[PDB]
Design a protein around this ligand. Structure first.
Ligand SMILES: CC(=O)SCCNC(=O)CCNC(=O)[C@H](O)C(C)(C)COP(=O)(O)OP(=O)(O)OC[C@H]1O[C@@H](n2cnc3c(N)ncnc32)[C@H](O)[C@@H]1OP(=O)(O)O
Length: 214
């Protein structure tokens, strides 16, 4: 409950009507959660996707930053001010091991299956590369596996996990019955963000096309 969790998805029927059914471009911007207002906006997005983490647990996971510790980034639709996609990470430096885990990742109602997840994941990996991180590791509930696998993550090999098993079991966020999955940053293509952004129709990004730390 501190370092253990269980993925319980909401089941309420969500309207899938595309929020980008409109015409011209939809301007959007990335951001880091730096205010209480941004914190609530992302918690609210996550809330509509998860039954567990529940409200108190989202409030615990989605925090203002302290290179290190917890960060939550989002993509904002500028015409509506709505949250489109968001990700919460924990950045770890343990011995020679510099890596990131991803406790939460969600795309909002009306925005699913448009390529926003791929785009946000690309921006994260780009940011991992640009900061000093070696790999991104995912605790994946059986229901998340297909998603992460489509984003190019793979089952972490037993020997690589045992390299950090003690630290992981005491410090990382672990979904009940999850498979541990990973992508090494050295394999992330330099054009990965550009190619994802190309695959999101009708969107133009304003400001830095990726994630920042302040
Ligand atoms: C605890 C957690 O955070 S679990 C991890 C995921 N979180 C959730 O399950 C929360 C609820 N779900 C969601 O918010 C969304 O459905 C997400 C995040 C899973 C997918 O986000 P989207 O923006 O729809 O993904 P996007 O359209 O960018 O698709 C990216 C890739 O994933 C694949 N994909 C999309 N939705 C799904 C799905 N439901 N199951 C499996 N693969 C999927 C796509 O086909 C694509 O792969 P491709 O390039 O081979 O075609």
């Amino acid at each position: 409950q501190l370092t253990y969790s269980q993925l319980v998805l909401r089941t309420a029927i969500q309207d899938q009507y595309s929020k980008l059914s409109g015409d011209g471009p939809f301007p959007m911007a990335f951001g880091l959660v730096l205010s209480e207002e941004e914190r609530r906006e992302v918690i609210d997005l996550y809330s509509l996707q998860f039954q567990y983490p529940d409200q108190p647990e989202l409030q615990r996971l989605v925090i203002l930053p302290q290179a290190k510790g917890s960060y939550t980034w989002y993509l904002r639709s500028l015409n509506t001010n709505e949250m489109v996609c968001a990700v919460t990470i924990m950045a770890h430096h343990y011995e020679t091991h510099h890596f990131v885990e991803v406790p939460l990742f969600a795309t909002g109602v009306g925005y699913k299956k448009h390529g926003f997840g791929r785009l946000m994941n690309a921006a994260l990996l780009q940011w991992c590369v640009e900061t000093g991180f070696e790999f991104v590791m995912i605790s994946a509930d059986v229901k998340a596996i297909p998603f992460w696998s489509h984003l190019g993550y793979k089952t972490m090999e037993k020997s690589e996990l045992t390299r950090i098993v003690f630290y992981y079991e005491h410090n990382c966020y672990k979904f009940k019955g999850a498979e541990v999955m990973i992508r090494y940053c050295r394999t992330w293509p330099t054009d990965g963000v550009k190619e994802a952004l190309a695959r999101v129709q009708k969107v133009i990004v304003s400001g830095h096309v990726g994630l920042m730390d302040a």
